[PDB]
Amino acid sequence: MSFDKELALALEIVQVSCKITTSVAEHTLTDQTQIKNDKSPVTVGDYSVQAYVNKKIHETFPEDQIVAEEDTKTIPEDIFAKVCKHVQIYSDMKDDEIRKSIDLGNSTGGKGRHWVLDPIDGTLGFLRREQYAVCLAFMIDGDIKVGVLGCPNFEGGLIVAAQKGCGAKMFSVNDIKNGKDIHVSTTPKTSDMCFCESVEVSHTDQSRSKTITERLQVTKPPVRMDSQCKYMAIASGRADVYLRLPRNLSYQEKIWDHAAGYLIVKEAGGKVTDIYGNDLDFSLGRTLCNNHGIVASNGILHEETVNVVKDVLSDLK
Ligand SMILES: [Mg+2]
Known part of the structure; x- marks a missing residue:
């Protein structure tokens, strides 16, 4: 009935994810952007974050499943190459292993332990250079146990986190050790x-x-x-x-x-x-x-x- 380990991992991983997205955003975005078949955008940030998070989750909790937004079915080669560069700052994975990590996100949810990841929530916000979030939750049988939102452009860069029964806390992106109750x-x-x-x-x-x-x-x-x-x-x-x-x-x-x-x-x-x-x-x-x-x-x-x-x-x- 306690999920300290999962909440701790979630914070750590979302903090690195915020570094990823910010780092992607230091360059022009158009050549980092793919239009999916439904005409919604996906960027080097979305894919890079998902590779990293899924790999970290699988390293600590290999038994869990992951529901994540993106997959590698349609990803262009120039986009992918950039993705590999960003991820290899933080994780020593080969290109093929980066592809696999992304595609770990194909769970359909429901019964059991599932992680729920939107590597960039509000990708139009990312492209707008205004609000976006790295969103990571953990749930069992559809009951949410852990919630983390990393919001790099919100009042200088904020992360908020909660686990069930224990209150909600706010951290800066640069410090996930010292938080305040909210x-x-x-x-x-x-x-x-x-x-x-x-x-x-x-x-x-x-x-x-x-x-x-x-x-x-x-x-x-x-x-x-x-x-x-x-x-x-x-x-x-x-x-x-x-x-x-x-x-x-x-x-x-x-x-x-x-x-x-x-x-x-x-x-x-x-x-x-x-x-x-x-x-x-x-x-x-x-x-x-x-x-x-x-x-x-x-x-x-x-x-x-x-x-x-x-x-x-x-x-x-
Ligand atoms: Mg998204």
């Missing part, structure tokens, strides 16, 4: 609420959120940002509510876009559900099959917010 805000009126959402217009319904927040009498403009950093904002008290509003009932969120943030907000004293107020169910594979969208909050504001969300999104198909 707690969600105490804001008890929706009118004084700082609300956050995706930058990308196609990742959340920004027209419906305006209508939601208008009904909740929110005075402050929304804080738009890429990534699971939005969960870090909630957990640390920097914002009060995070909305992710779908345009249909068919899209299902990936578990590597929510697993770390979910636990972290809860251990920080907040609340995370979908738009209907239902708890997120991470036991149904790689996607949140039985959930629609996200509402994350400081807990006090939650139900007041959900009630308006549900109503405005009552027409969904």
